[PDB]
Amino acid sequence: ITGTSTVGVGRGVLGDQKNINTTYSTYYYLQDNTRGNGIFTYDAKYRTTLPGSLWADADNQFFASYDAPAVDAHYYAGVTYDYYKNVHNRLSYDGNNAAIRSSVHYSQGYNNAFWNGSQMVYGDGDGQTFIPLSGGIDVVAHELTHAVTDYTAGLIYQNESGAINEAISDIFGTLVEFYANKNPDWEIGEDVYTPGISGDSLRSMSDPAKYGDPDHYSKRYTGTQDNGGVHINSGIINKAAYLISQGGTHYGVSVVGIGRDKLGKIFYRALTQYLTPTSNFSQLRAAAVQSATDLYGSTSQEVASVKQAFDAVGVK
Template identity: 70%
Template sequence: MKKFLATSLVASVLVVPTVVGAEGLQSGKLTKASSEPAASIVKEYVEGKGDFSVQDVQKDGSSHIVRLQQEVDGVPVFGSVVVGNVAKDGTLKAIVNDAVKVKGKPGLDKKIAISEKKALKLYKKSIKATEFEVAPTSELVVYPVKDDAVYAYKITSTVLAGDEPSRWTYFIDANSGKVINKYDQLAHAKPVTTITGTTTVGSGTTVLGTSATFNTTKNGSYYYLQDSTRGKGISTYDAKNRTSLPGSLWADADNVLNATYDRAAVSAQVNAVKTYDFYKNTYGRNSYDNAGAALNSTVHYSSRYNNAFWDGSKMVYGDGDGSTFTYLSGALDVVAHELTHAVTEYTAGLVYQNESGAINEAVSDIMGTVAEYSVGSNFDWLVGEDIYTPGVSGDALRSMSNPAAYGDPDHYSKRYTGTADNGGVHTNSGIVNKAAYLLGNGGTHYGVTVPGVGVPKLGAIYYRALNVYLTPTSNFSYLRAAVVQSAKDLYGSSSAEAAAAAKSFDAVGVY
């Protein structure tokens, strides 16, 4: 169980989207000044690459960040996104162009022979599930594959029955009915309920044995673990060692939660609040969707469950078996790691396979570590050390400073190339983690010396890369370009930070 903290643990890699003709990240003064809307400027720049719809336009200081979705006759091309950074004077100063050449591909000439209803039947048969937490939903997409492209149904559901919760996402060829690709990524669970009442301050003991205070909501004769002062609320629920979610909103009679059973709930609530505050106060991000989405947690999930996961609407924590793990809500870096998966879902949308999946995992490790530095009390470059093997001191799930200590590669030449673990999403994250450690802390690796810029700047650079430049199918080379460009945006094109960002990837063999 050393490879945990995932949106998915089940590995199944068939065909990965192939980005044909993508140009990566370009920067400089790419266009002349213009008075046209930012979205029009970006669209004109990629004209001839295909048709695009505007996904999002965000104000970014004096610039605008434009995100376009490529389409074919109104059908989205999976993983094909264009991101443009348009300066105040209307010049395009940076662009990530993942547009692919799909028009005219022979696969798109084939008629759609499989109905959505039939595709859903094939999906249910494949995953062998009859009970769903969230029923399967389907979307028709254009799926690039090798030198071709086909119409496919992207189908996803949430299943809690069985040994392990899952969210299987399948791509089913709309012509042949064959499964093109599949990966497991937990999804949305049913909505949770909230209460109204008076905000009060409760106290309690965390999993680590420390004292804490936190906002609660008083309703009638009970105090509930619901903080209504942040976003749309931060709440904790009790699954009572069952697998039905979300469970019951945590209630207490005296607003003092010091019992052993209370500790998992206290930690979940306190660490969720700290993570919310970290993103809000450091980056101005209002919850994972940047619109104040409620942060809900469920503790005491299942029996002796050695894992934690983000299911699309809430965090879910097992109690651990007492040997491999203790209560998993006890570690701030674990909570921030999982909630960063949610941030990733609402920003770059990194596909949870191969290099994009390893970036997904590494960014969660990085932001979990930065959160521990910013709002925690026991900063280090380890991941999950507070809750892993409680009877053994000094060990952890992963190390950012020395990934090899836990069997993970610290250089691209040592990367895992198999299909297990969704193509090594946890294993190969060690390469990015090492680069991030070198950027934040400094050091010499494989003969390359990297001057450290400090943990806060490390976080700012990677958060910007995630929020602005990364796209669903970004690989390690794209990550390098995104991180370096983010450092240039924040600190200047010729800054020491930008130079250090480039050196950090030199040190791990990513170019």
């Protein structure tokens, strides 16, 4: 909508207060005009019809319980946009400042969030397995990274290509969590998963087996469920990424860590220059090795650590 840019205030899913960019035109709308062609947050009103109604508020204050998922979806979309702009020189998910759209209050008791090819969608959770999923910055950045992948490598959502797709979203979801310095960790979804249980998460990059996900290619899932294990076999790639960044010994193979920033540069270059829709794990290794070579040299420690990491998880 056309109007005047301003700044409101509200509280997110976890009770924290934050300022959000809004637009005034009779109502105050969750429309951020400061980032690309805009960030727009919609109310799905517990229905499954999308996108719903652009979020409208009478006084530019968002402290109602109903408001919290919209505040965080709106705010964390902006943080993710800033990350890709400031760190990787990418303007929105298409590289041309495409508008970012999110709908909250999707359905009733829906324990998931997703990118649907055109926008982000967030359930509220059932209150036991999940609280509203936009409260997790790694969740939000995970979903928006699916849009980046769709517009770059185009990894198809099944088998090893799909597991790479999910791993990329976990990797940059975590890097965005570190970028915002919001209680950062190498876990996925810990802020919105099981509000009654402390210290757990949806999956772990540092130790995927902690939740029954493979940490080595010999333990990969080979069935047909989960589109061929896209959320399962991603643990193999997540572990390799964790090793590249932080280092460690895994199944007897030692990896010298090179840090998060270099991990992001290597995988972003692999994603945008070398991966294709049908890439498999072995091709991802070649892409990451070539990306590290482009950036740091064929004799560099960086290239060495990439090779060791994939060796450690059994990917040749």
